Amino acid sequence: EVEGNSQLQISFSTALASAEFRVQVCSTQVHCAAECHPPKDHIVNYPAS
């Protein structure tokens, strides 16, 4: 929802820990970056992002 001058907390994952990932809000683009910390346990059940 874009209702006004507000924020959406987009929850998406990546693979590389330092990641400049691009997301577009429907006519806007953006390339925002983050520093990811690696996971704890080795064994998971499902695949990855």
């Binding site: 346990d41 080795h42 064994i43 998971v44």
Partner: protein
């Protein structure tokens, strides 16, 4: 002292397919380390 002059009758107890309940044992201890999965299962029967 006879040829093949014999008889044929019914035979009882016909077979059929049913569904028998069998057990499955509890899952063991899991340790998910780096490329390793330590499964400490203790089976209560011969369990493949």
């Amino acid at each position: 002292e006879l040829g093949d002059r014999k008889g044929k009758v019914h035979i009882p107890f016909p077979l059929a397919n049913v569904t028998c309940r069998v057990p499955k044992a509890r899952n063991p201890t899991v340790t998910y380390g780096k490329n390793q999965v330590i499964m400490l299962l203790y089976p209560d029967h011969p369990t493949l």
